[PDB]
Structure 1
Amino acid sequence: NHNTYFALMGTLRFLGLYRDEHQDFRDEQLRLKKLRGKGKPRKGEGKRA
């Protein structure tokens, strides 16, 4: 079960036990992506506007 390992390790991460450098890379990069101003649009907003 992939849901199991995924969720379990993510929890253990936010609970500050396990440490994910991949998720940290991802996070930091979306941080520098949105800080730039190109983010992920709030649903419904992007196309028509």
Structure 2
Amino acid sequence: LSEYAVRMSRLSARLFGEVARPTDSKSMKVVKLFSEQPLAKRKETYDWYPNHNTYFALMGTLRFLGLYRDEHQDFRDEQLRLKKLRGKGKPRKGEGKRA
């Protein structure tokens, strides 16, 4: 290790774009975060979920517009119809406890 080698390493850092002056291993962290993509901005992170609200809303609108037919909501509608025909339905909001 010589001062010539120090100048060669510093010159190589200046031409290739690294940090020329000596820097701590703790202090190379800020270089690492500014060089890498942050974790919350990665497409795997924010685009992790499909837009379930738009999926459900689109497919429900197609169900009521009669281009797609949904057997599962047909099953729920028939079961709720049978429950209301039997007489045990969903009460109004605010009538259940006091009455």
TM-score, scaled relative to structure 1: 0.95
**Which of 35, 38, 48 is the matching residue for 2:85?**
35
Cα distance in structure 2, aligned partners of 1:45 and 1:4: 33
Q: Give the CA deviation at 1:16.
A: 0.5
Cα distance in structure 1, aligned partners of 2:92 and 2:63: 26
Give the structure with higher Rg (CA). Answer: 2
For these two proteins, the number of residue pairs brought into alignment is 49
Q: Give the CA deviation at 1:22.
A: 0.2
Cα distance in structure 1, aligned partners of 2:57 and 2:64: 11
2:57 paired residue number = 7
TM-score, scaled relative to structure 2: 0.49
Cα distance in structure 1, aligned partners of 2:83 and 2:97: 20
Cα distance in structure 2, aligned partners of 1:15 and 1:8: 10
Cα distance in structure 2, aligned partners of 1:3 and 1:15: 18
Which segments of structure 1 move beyond 6 Å, counting only runs of 4 or more? none
Q: Give the CA deviation at 1:25.
A: 0.3
Cα distance in structure 2, aligned partners of 1:20 and 1:26: 10
State the Cα RMSD in Å. 0.5
Tell me: higher relative CO, structure 1 or 2? Use CA pairs within 8 A at least 6 residues apart.
1
Q: Give the CA deviation at 1:46.
A: 1.0
Q: Which runs of 5+ in 2 are unaligned?
A: 1-50
Q: Which runs of 5+ in 1 are unaligned?
A: none
Percentage identity across aligned positions? 100
